Amino acid sequence: MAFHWCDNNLHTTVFTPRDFQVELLATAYERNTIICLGHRSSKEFIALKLLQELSRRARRHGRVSVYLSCEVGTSTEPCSIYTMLTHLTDLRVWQEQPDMQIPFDHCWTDYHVSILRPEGFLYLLETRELLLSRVELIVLEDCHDSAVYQRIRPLFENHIMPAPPADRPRILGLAGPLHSAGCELQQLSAMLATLEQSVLCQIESASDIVTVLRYCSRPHEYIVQCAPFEMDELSLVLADVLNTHKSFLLDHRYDDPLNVINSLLVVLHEMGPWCTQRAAHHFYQCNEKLKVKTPHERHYLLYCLVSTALIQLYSLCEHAFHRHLSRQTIERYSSPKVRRLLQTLRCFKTLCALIYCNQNHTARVLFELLAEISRRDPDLKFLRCQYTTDRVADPTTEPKEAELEHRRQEEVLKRFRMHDCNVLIGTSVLEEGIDVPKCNLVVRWDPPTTYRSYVQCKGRARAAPAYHVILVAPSYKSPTVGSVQLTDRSHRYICATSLASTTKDLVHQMAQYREIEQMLLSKCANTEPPEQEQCEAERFSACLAAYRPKPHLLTGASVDLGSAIALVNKYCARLPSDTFTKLTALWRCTRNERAGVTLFQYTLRLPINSPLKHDIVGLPMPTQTLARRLAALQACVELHRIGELDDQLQPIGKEGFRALEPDWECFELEPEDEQIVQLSDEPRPGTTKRRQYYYKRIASEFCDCRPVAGAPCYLYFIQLTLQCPIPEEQNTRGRKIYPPEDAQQGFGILTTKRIPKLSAFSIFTRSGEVKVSLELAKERVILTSEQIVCINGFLNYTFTNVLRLQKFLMLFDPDSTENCVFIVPTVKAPAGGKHIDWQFLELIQANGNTMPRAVPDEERQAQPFDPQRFQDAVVMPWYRNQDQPQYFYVAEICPHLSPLSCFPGDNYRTFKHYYLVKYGLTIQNTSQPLLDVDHTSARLNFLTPRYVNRKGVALPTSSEETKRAKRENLEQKQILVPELCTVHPFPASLWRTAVCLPCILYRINGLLLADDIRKQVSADLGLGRQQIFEWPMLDFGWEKRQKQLSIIQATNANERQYQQTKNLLIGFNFKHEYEESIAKLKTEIESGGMLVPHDQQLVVSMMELLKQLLPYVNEDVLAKKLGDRRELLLSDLVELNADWVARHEQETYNVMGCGDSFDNYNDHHRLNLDEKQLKLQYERAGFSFDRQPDLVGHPGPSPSIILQALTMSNANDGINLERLETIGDSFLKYAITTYLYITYENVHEGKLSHLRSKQVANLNLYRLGRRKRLGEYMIATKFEPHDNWLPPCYYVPKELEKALADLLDIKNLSSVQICEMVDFSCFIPYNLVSQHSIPDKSIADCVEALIGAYLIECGPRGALLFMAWLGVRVLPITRQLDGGNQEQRIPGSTKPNAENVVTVYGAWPTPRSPLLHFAPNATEELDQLLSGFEEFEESLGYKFRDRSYLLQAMTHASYTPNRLTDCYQRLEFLGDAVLDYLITRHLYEDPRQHSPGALTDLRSALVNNTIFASLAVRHGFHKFFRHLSPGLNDVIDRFVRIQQENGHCIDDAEDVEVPKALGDVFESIAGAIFLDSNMSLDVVWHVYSNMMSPEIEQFSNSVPKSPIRELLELEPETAKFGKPEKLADGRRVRVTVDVFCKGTFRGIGRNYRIAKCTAAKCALRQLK
Amino acid sequence: AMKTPVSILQELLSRRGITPGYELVQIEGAIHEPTFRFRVSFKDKDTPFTAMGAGRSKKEAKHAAARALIDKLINPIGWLQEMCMQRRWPPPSYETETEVGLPHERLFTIACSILNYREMGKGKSKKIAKRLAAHRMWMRLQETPTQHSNKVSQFHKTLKNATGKKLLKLQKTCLKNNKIDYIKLLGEIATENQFEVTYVDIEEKTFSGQFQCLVQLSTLPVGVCHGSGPTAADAQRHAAQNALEYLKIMTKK
RNA sequence: UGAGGUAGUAGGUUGUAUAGUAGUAAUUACACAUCAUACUAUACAACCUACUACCUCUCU
Ligand SMILES: [Ca+2]
Ligand SMILES: [Ca+2]
Ligand SMILES: [Ca+2]
Ligand SMILES: [Ca+2]
Ligand SMILES: [Ca+2]
Ligand SMILES: [Ca+2]
Ligand SMILES: [Ca+2]
Ligand SMILES: [Ca+2]
Ligand SMILES: [Ca+2]
Ligand SMILES: [Ca+2]
């Protein structure tokens, strides 16, 4: 965006170098070396890794390491490296105590690293219980200063030198910089050779210094002598004034100003009066605070007199060029060194300049000069300059200005990082640490007085035409003459108005520095080809017809010889890695002679995660640049062959990758869906934002179902049995409970086709909890033509007059196509059983729509009260509600009341009154009982109870007042008069079952739609049964040492780097225990144009090439092979070498690299390691998870569980899909991942994620279930039987709803002819009675929920086969051709579809183990690269039976010694899916019955890379995670340091970094235990329950939450986390959260994620 | 009077027999709210009246259907809380201010106050009271939601402008001669320019065995000019000489 | 369990926002920037539902 520049990308000629540390330990692995590193932490990393590798070599026939260490044996505090060795390896390490004397019984051979002090090992080897032939490594902690050198000299000169080299171990000597040893240099070349003679090594100094020396663009060195600085009048006056004040302040008396004097005199003598005033700026700003900040009055006088001296200088300069009179103005008054810096910036006109200094005022005044001149001159418009100072304040005192300083460093180094400023005028902090862009100029201001300042800041200029310009000026000579007053020239001014010695000594200094780096490159082994070899190969790079994927087209891709190496580097830098991995191409040069010329073959090696597991043995050329280029050309041809590089020859990437199996590519659908997909402005498919309307599919047992006369139809009884009487707390009226199983008159289904078995569900009535079933009448019932008419009239009566269910628009259609079953009133028999009540049917026919007769007084006088006419009756009154009556039950016939018993109110007298007054009626029998009545039911949804809600919680009942109070107060009763009521022909008991009917019919249709799904999939893929034992019932479910230890651990971990930063000092010297080269380099510097002076401005035919490049092939053979072709195909080089190899004996090559660099550590197979000569060939029960029922013969799921899956949560029903839907979501993602691991055996898992994410998305699962039309089987609505239900045998026009004896043509003829025969607008689509809207995501939810249903009954295989039915092909196909009759019908095996075949779905194979046999003894190297993981296997309890899974899971992408497997990344991808599923399935089965949110948050707390890394460290990982990364070793070091503080428990805050690779290896061990166990989930869960079950149980009873979520919801609209800002270091970042009006709290970490997490932990423990 | 129109229609029917019946025509679950549409009917014997109505709530739709029949027979809100999250605030707290004692016709008043303003709202229920109060409070919040050395040079220029003729006399006299009295002339400049001079000769002796003096300008800055001599008086004279040098190099323009 | 109104309380759906957990990268040196890839939370809100408490008109 803003940065967007080249940043060198990657290297094109040298293979993009590996980082130096693993190269050093490569060389150390086979040579006695002396590693010259100033950083103790780097030396400690190499020592740690090297003791680890040679320890693996050691414990095979019995050896030991030693770590002779001078800083041991004084305190019993364990040393620097005892921490790292005892908490990051599995070895047992024994730093000895001060005056250690063998604690008890202490056999030394049971110790692996054995930290000692040098005289301690002299003791212990003269003790002769630690034999030298048993020692396998001797790490001289220091051998680069004279004291420990004299102390370790008795060891070598007594034991190591009188020992044959078949017994002398590796003598890794942790020296410091040989490039900082400070002995002039005239004896330097002696002493290290002396050292090499006496510690018996040879220095293999390959540092960050040297890795810029070999494998970088060497910048152009321009050591400019500037000029002598002469003085004008004004500068002479200024020198007079400051010399006067200096000589006075020598004599001023107090029985820090010399800092200002000794700084400002140097500024005057190196920059001039202008920079003297702009440093009077800095020092007077120091005095303006430090004259007030002192308490001593005479020190106050002293600082303020120096302040007035700076005022005097500033006024002198201000009165000199603004007042005596501006690029000629600054150039007049600047010293010439400033002028040469101006020419160096002017010439280099794009820039990334990195000027260096060593004092903070110097950098500030350089900033001010560049700011002024850049705002003046035309040339340097592009210089926008930003400076730096060092750390002058302290975190103890004045933290406000110290923090403002730290924010200024942060805000300067962020805007140098992209491109906002090109110029960074720094100081000594910028040498190491701080990361900068690639630089094309470093103008060093002072001479670099140390070698290390020279090299670490010249080695920052890497933008390929980079420059290194050192300015040279005469050094400071004091012109002070004494304590005199102002001079004659000073007074006249105020009243009127040796280059050669310095240049020669810097030439000798830089000749010394050149000899230092020449000795450094002398000591380095991997020598690199000179520039003329590159020029020769560049000339030679056209005699080869480049490899072409599409050779017919001259636009298509091409691999020449330069692009060969650039393409190998581009391929390996696109291979996948984490933050701490360096993925590079390894390379082994060689030489041998071939009938004349000597030829330089290569061998190649790509990263371990690459699919290319072979050694690309390159082809020889006369010059090693040319055969390097050809070896990478052979690599790129083989890359394109094997299919990494595709037909355009740039590596493939995730997006362009395509699924290989053709079923996985289809993703096709009904064309309105892709219309909406291409629209991109409606709610897109698969989401919950798009509502599609479907049809409430009446079951296929209810369509075409009505009996006609004579047709034998089945009679089902709607049996109701009360299982749970109402609690009397809810009984706010005290009515008797009425069981319905002893009621006389109930109902029956009557149907031509059988409803199959269903779940005996339960309803929740006014009288309690009832169980609704269905039972058949055995004698199939023959209807005559007459009884159909009475059942038609009865059914219109029962669902229109009694229950009032019939809507307006719908009709009764007695001869109707769909939803056409009969309901008949059943009477119990006296002996037993029921039948249809024919007498009651005749009564219903006779008593038609009889409006109740308003009885006149004759019958009221004539006939009396009857108890039997009102006991168990429905007693609707006739004096009011004449046409739409109101029906009451009868609770009791109350005898104590009467029409003369008192009126409960006071506006009337008793009950025989106010029937005359309100109505006009007269009670005749005034000696009759009365009627305690309660209303009949009018909310017919009896599917949910009303006294217990969804979570098992029982809702508040009706106290004790509103009970047995107003229960029995006569105001709050309905008491009716029996002569003022008509007994409805439907009795009360028949009214109980009749009012329960609508929800009975709804739940039977729902269980039938679910059984339709079951029979459907059992028809298609053998999965279930077609018909039949009863289904399971439908039920709903209801202090200070802590901080002391923490400070100790964090401080010593940082104190390794503090000891480095207190070691910019001098190293080795010899107390008795070149010049020609310097003169040559001096002549080179003065003569080769490197030294600018103080006045010069700064600045063949193809046959001949075929003869040269092929000198081992003569005039013959070549003449035939070339032919008339213009340029050879690469096959001709390959073929000619193949011929020569065929002719002769076995060649014996020469391994080169000056030895061991990039060899013996990586890719070596056939070597004599003594003399380094190759002989190569160019040519190759308690809740099981995996429990599966016997799926053949299985009936599939139950329709209650399928119904549960089909039931959305908008139903407000009992059952619900959601727990199945989360479990099926996780099982689907799991199973897709496992098949993608089986199938794409070489594909990088970021493309397996692409393929899985295509299979598992919401679009795919919606689209599949819509292909199966699952929207038309779902329950998505609150069932109100008066609003969205169609009673049996009625009909609805289905179109006449919206488009608005004549109503009975709509089914008969048409709809539009019926139409035209005669809040947010008004139009609404969609039909309530027979449709229901469903979101597309809800269809995907029902898809995952149905996988959940098939999962929980019929196993993992059944859920795989259900997603095979549904369309996700995630199994293999083995087709037979009518292989049977499909009577045996193994599940999976579909129809004999079209031509008579079956298409059986196969199981999952055991995949081939990832043991790469590209090396000849990979089983023995697997036995040897996993020595001692048995204690690790005991640390997790499962023995890997194919251990390359274990090594593969433990192998980081940087562990380049591994040649046998891949990295862990594919197993990490698989084991995440396995772990996610296992945790979700575990939290499903806890009897607390977690919600979706509970299970998700408890998984996110149980599965989390921080919890993963903490349980990794706690249960013993990280001592077996084999990496070779330095930074990851640092992070593991600090994190296990803290985790042993805590005893394995879970300014700016700085939490310790959580090592993400430890969480990844926690996952990858799950993936490897999965794959290694023939894909079982009860071998993964055994191990990981044994690890995380304390965490499961602890987070089960509470809620941990992530710190970020917990803060952000505990202050819910208040804890706001802000954008990250990068620090000064450039690998750290800081996050601040403002808990509003309570504080800003700050955290740091390498990345944004751990930075917000740390900031959240800061505010969390703050607000407590 | 204030009966709901569904109960008003029920009252007009219950005095004439006849109980109405409501049937739901169409519910529509759109992107942000569902609408409900009821149909109310009126007998099956003599002039069977009917109507339909709709609203975003079931009771609102039943009310609108009954109101139409009477006439025939005659959403976030928390954009406020998002805005509170924007301007770095804790969440608002509306509070139950007061209520009416009648149970079925109580009109709540609820006030919401934060650090800036206060608002309130009256509703037939307390939820719509919060909606009206939060609308008024959202309306209320959405209507009205070195240089030190140069300074020293500047006011020393001002004190120079307030000095007078002795600056130009100082410029046009060579200070090499001691025949002009340095201490006396510095005191004259003090009397001239509203300040005083200070002379400090500290009691000890140097390594050279000489005496020294510091002159302090009793003005706004701290101020020291140094001087030394073999005697105390010559040291004070040389300190006043350097003070004359200070004022001299300040003066020339 | 007439109808209405109000208060809690207990369920769920949907919207909007802030997120999280897992996965995943390629731009990018490498990261940030992710994420119509999966799951969910919180806050506010709309709605549906159940019960209780107080009422008013009924009804008795
Ligand atoms: Ca009921
Ligand atoms: Ca009712
Ligand atoms: Ca090999
Ligand atoms: Ca899913
Ligand atoms: Ca879902
Ligand atoms: Ca991972
Ligand atoms: Ca009510
Ligand atoms: Ca994505
Ligand atoms: Ca996302
Ligand atoms: Ca998503």
Short mmCIF file of C-alpha atoms in Angstrom, two decimals, chain B residues 18-251:
data_model
loop_
_atom_site.label_atom_id
_atom_site.label_comp_id
_atom_site.label_asym_id
_atom_site.label_seq_id
_atom_site.Cartn_x
_atom_site.Cartn_y
_atom_site.Cartn_z
CA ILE B 18 -73.19 -12.29 18.36
CA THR B 19 -69.54 -12.97 19.20
CA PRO B 20 -66.97 -12.09 16.49
CA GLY B 21 -64.20 -14.35 15.28
CA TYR B 22 -60.69 -13.38 14.20
CA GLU B 23 -58.73 -15.36 11.60
CA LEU B 24 -55.14 -14.62 10.62
CA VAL B 25 -54.88 -13.94 6.89
CA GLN B 26 -51.14 -13.61 6.38
CA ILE B 27 -47.93 -13.26 8.36
CA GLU B 28 -44.80 -12.11 6.54
CA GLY B 29 -41.35 -12.67 7.99
CA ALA B 30 -39.32 -10.07 6.09
CA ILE B 31 -35.72 -9.00 6.57
CA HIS B 32 -36.17 -6.96 9.76
CA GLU B 33 -39.68 -7.45 11.23
CA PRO B 34 -42.71 -9.70 10.66
CA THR B 35 -46.12 -8.32 9.74
CA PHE B 36 -49.41 -9.91 10.80
CA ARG B 37 -52.73 -9.59 8.98
CA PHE B 38 -56.00 -10.71 10.63
CA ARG B 39 -59.52 -11.08 9.25
CA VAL B 40 -62.54 -10.48 11.48
CA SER B 41 -65.95 -11.87 10.54
CA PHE B 42 -69.49 -11.00 11.53
CA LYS B 43 -72.12 -13.82 11.62
CA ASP B 44 -73.46 -16.22 8.97
CA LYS B 45 -77.19 -15.45 9.06
CA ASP B 46 -78.04 -11.82 8.19
CA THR B 47 -75.65 -9.44 6.34
CA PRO B 48 -72.38 -11.27 7.14
CA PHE B 49 -69.93 -8.38 7.55
CA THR B 50 -66.17 -8.95 7.31
CA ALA B 51 -62.91 -7.01 7.31
CA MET B 52 -59.15 -7.48 7.46
CA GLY B 53 -56.35 -5.47 9.02
CA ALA B 54 -52.65 -5.62 9.68
CA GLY B 55 -49.80 -4.43 11.86
CA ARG B 56 -46.35 -5.35 13.07
CA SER B 57 -47.74 -6.98 16.22
CA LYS B 58 -50.57 -9.48 16.68
CA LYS B 59 -52.47 -7.24 19.08
CA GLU B 60 -51.84 -4.21 16.85
CA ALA B 61 -53.17 -6.15 13.85
CA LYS B 62 -56.25 -7.38 15.72
CA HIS B 63 -56.79 -3.78 16.86
CA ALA B 64 -56.48 -2.46 13.30
CA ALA B 65 -58.92 -5.09 12.00
CA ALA B 66 -61.48 -4.16 14.65
CA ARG B 67 -60.94 -0.44 14.00
CA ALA B 68 -61.55 -0.98 10.27
CA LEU B 69 -64.74 -2.85 11.13
CA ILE B 70 -65.86 0.02 13.38
CA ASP B 71 -65.26 2.46 10.52
CA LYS B 72 -67.18 0.11 8.22
CA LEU B 73 -70.15 0.08 10.63
CA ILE B 74 -70.22 3.89 10.86
CA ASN B 75 -35.63 -1.55 14.16
CA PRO B 76 -32.37 -1.03 16.11
CA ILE B 77 -33.00 1.91 18.55
CA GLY B 78 -29.53 1.09 19.95
CA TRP B 79 -27.88 3.41 17.47
CA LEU B 80 -27.99 5.58 20.61
CA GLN B 81 -25.84 3.01 22.41
CA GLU B 82 -23.55 2.60 19.39
CA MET B 83 -23.09 6.39 19.41
CA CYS B 84 -22.35 6.22 23.14
CA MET B 85 -19.70 3.61 22.30
CA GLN B 86 -18.30 5.98 19.65
CA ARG B 87 -17.71 9.00 21.90
CA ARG B 88 -15.84 7.04 24.61
CA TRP B 89 -18.59 6.69 27.23
CA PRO B 90 -20.03 4.12 29.65
CA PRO B 91 -23.51 2.91 28.65
CA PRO B 92 -26.56 5.05 29.45
CA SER B 93 -28.90 4.26 32.33
CA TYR B 94 -32.54 5.18 31.94
CA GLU B 95 -34.30 5.03 35.31
CA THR B 96 -37.90 4.39 36.40
CA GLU B 97 -38.90 7.86 37.57
CA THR B 98 -42.62 7.60 38.37
CA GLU B 99 -45.83 5.73 37.63
CA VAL B 100 -49.60 6.08 38.04
CA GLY B 101 -51.30 4.16 40.85
CA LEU B 102 -54.10 2.72 38.71
CA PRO B 103 -53.22 -0.83 37.59
CA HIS B 104 -54.71 -1.01 34.09
CA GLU B 105 -54.24 2.60 32.95
CA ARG B 106 -50.85 3.56 34.42
CA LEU B 107 -48.76 5.90 32.26
CA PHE B 108 -45.10 5.57 33.21
CA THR B 109 -42.57 8.41 33.18
CA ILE B 110 -38.97 7.23 32.75
CA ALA B 111 -35.90 9.48 32.72
CA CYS B 112 -32.51 8.77 31.13
CA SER B 113 -29.52 10.78 32.33
CA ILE B 114 -25.85 10.64 31.38
CA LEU B 115 -22.86 12.92 31.95
CA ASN B 116 -24.11 15.52 29.44
CA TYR B 117 -27.92 15.96 29.58
CA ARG B 118 -31.16 14.52 30.99
CA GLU B 119 -34.33 13.45 29.15
CA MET B 120 -37.54 11.59 29.96
CA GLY B 121 -40.53 9.92 28.37
CA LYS B 122 -44.17 9.13 29.19
CA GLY B 123 -45.70 5.92 27.89
CA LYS B 124 -48.82 3.81 28.22
CA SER B 125 -46.40 0.99 29.08
CA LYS B 126 -42.89 1.38 30.42
CA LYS B 127 -41.31 -0.11 27.29
CA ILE B 128 -42.80 2.57 25.03
CA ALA B 129 -41.87 5.00 27.83
CA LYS B 130 -38.24 3.95 27.33
CA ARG B 131 -38.66 4.29 23.55
CA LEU B 132 -39.97 7.84 23.83
CA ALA B 133 -37.33 8.76 26.44
CA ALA B 134 -34.50 7.24 24.37
CA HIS B 135 -35.80 8.99 21.24
CA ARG B 136 -35.79 12.30 23.11
CA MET B 137 -32.31 11.65 24.53
CA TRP B 138 -30.98 10.54 21.14
CA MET B 139 -32.49 13.75 19.76
CA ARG B 140 -30.84 15.74 22.57
CA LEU B 141 -27.40 14.19 21.96
CA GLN B 142 -27.73 14.33 18.16
CA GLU B 143 -28.73 18.01 18.14
CA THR B 144 -25.93 19.27 20.43
CA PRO B 145 -23.39 16.45 21.07
CA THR B 146 16.69 26.88 21.07
CA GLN B 147 13.25 28.44 21.36
CA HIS B 148 14.04 29.12 25.02
CA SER B 149 17.24 30.86 23.89
CA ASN B 150 15.27 32.85 21.30
CA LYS B 151 12.79 33.89 24.01
CA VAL B 152 15.73 34.98 26.20
CA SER B 153 17.10 36.97 23.25
CA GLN B 154 13.66 38.56 22.73
CA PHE B 155 13.08 39.92 26.20
CA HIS B 156 16.74 40.86 26.56
CA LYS B 157 16.16 42.88 23.39
CA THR B 158 13.22 44.49 25.21
CA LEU B 159 15.40 45.28 28.23
CA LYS B 160 18.02 46.60 25.80
CA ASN B 161 15.38 48.91 24.32
CA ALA B 162 14.58 49.97 27.88
CA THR B 163 18.27 50.50 28.75
CA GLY B 164 19.11 53.75 26.95
CA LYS B 165 22.30 55.51 25.86
CA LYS B 166 24.81 53.37 27.79
CA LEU B 167 24.41 50.52 25.28
CA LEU B 168 25.59 52.75 22.42
CA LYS B 169 28.32 54.19 24.66
CA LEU B 170 29.31 50.59 25.43
CA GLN B 171 29.42 49.81 21.71
CA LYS B 172 31.49 52.88 20.84
CA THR B 173 34.02 52.41 23.66
CA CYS B 174 36.80 49.84 23.65
CA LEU B 175 36.63 47.74 26.82
CA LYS B 176 40.33 46.81 26.75
CA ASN B 177 41.12 49.89 28.83
CA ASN B 178 40.26 49.71 32.52
CA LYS B 179 40.11 53.52 32.72
CA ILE B 180 36.34 53.24 32.34
CA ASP B 181 34.96 51.97 35.65
CA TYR B 182 33.31 48.63 34.92
CA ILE B 183 31.48 48.13 38.22
CA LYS B 184 30.31 51.76 38.36
CA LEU B 185 29.07 51.73 34.77
CA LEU B 186 27.24 48.43 35.32
CA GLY B 187 25.58 50.05 38.34
CA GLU B 188 24.73 53.05 36.15
CA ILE B 189 23.06 50.65 33.69
CA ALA B 190 21.20 49.13 36.67
CA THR B 191 19.91 52.53 37.80
CA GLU B 192 19.13 53.37 34.16
CA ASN B 193 17.18 50.21 33.22
CA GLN B 194 15.11 49.62 36.41
CA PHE B 195 17.18 46.60 37.56
CA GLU B 196 20.04 45.98 39.97
CA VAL B 197 23.38 44.27 39.59
CA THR B 198 24.74 41.52 41.82
CA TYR B 199 28.39 40.72 42.57
CA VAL B 200 29.40 37.43 44.19
CA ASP B 201 33.02 36.82 45.18
CA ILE B 202 33.05 33.38 46.78
CA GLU B 203 35.49 33.10 49.67
CA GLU B 204 37.79 30.28 48.53
CA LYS B 205 40.91 30.48 46.34
CA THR B 206 41.57 28.66 43.10
CA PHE B 207 44.29 26.22 42.12
CA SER B 208 45.96 29.23 40.48
CA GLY B 209 45.61 31.14 43.76
CA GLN B 210 43.52 33.88 42.15
CA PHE B 211 40.14 35.44 42.93
CA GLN B 212 36.98 35.35 40.84
CA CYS B 213 33.57 37.00 40.75
CA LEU B 214 30.20 36.26 39.17
CA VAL B 215 27.87 39.12 38.24
CA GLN B 216 24.14 38.34 38.24
CA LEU B 217 21.67 40.47 36.30
CA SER B 218 18.68 40.92 38.60
CA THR B 219 16.15 40.51 35.78
CA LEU B 220 13.85 37.75 34.54
CA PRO B 221 16.50 35.07 33.62
CA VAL B 222 19.11 33.53 35.90
CA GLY B 223 22.14 35.42 34.53
CA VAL B 224 25.88 35.07 35.28
CA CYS B 225 28.88 36.72 33.67
CA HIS B 226 32.24 35.49 34.96
CA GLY B 227 35.49 37.22 35.75
CA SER B 228 38.74 36.71 37.58
CA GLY B 229 41.85 38.53 38.70
CA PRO B 230 44.79 38.35 41.09
CA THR B 231 42.79 40.39 43.62
CA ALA B 232 39.14 40.43 44.62
CA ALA B 233 38.48 43.91 43.22
CA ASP B 234 40.17 43.17 39.88
CA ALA B 235 38.13 39.95 39.65
CA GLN B 236 34.91 41.90 40.25
CA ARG B 237 36.00 44.49 37.68
CA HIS B 238 36.67 41.74 35.12
CA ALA B 239 33.29 40.17 35.90
CA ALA B 240 31.65 43.55 35.28
CA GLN B 241 33.80 43.76 32.14
CA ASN B 242 32.30 40.49 30.90
CA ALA B 243 28.85 41.83 31.79
CA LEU B 244 29.70 44.82 29.59
CA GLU B 245 30.76 42.30 26.91
CA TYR B 246 27.39 40.55 27.30
CA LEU B 247 25.39 43.76 26.91
CA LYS B 248 27.76 44.87 24.13
CA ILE B 249 27.30 41.78 21.97
CA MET B 250 23.58 41.99 22.68
CA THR B 251 23.48 45.64 21.61
#
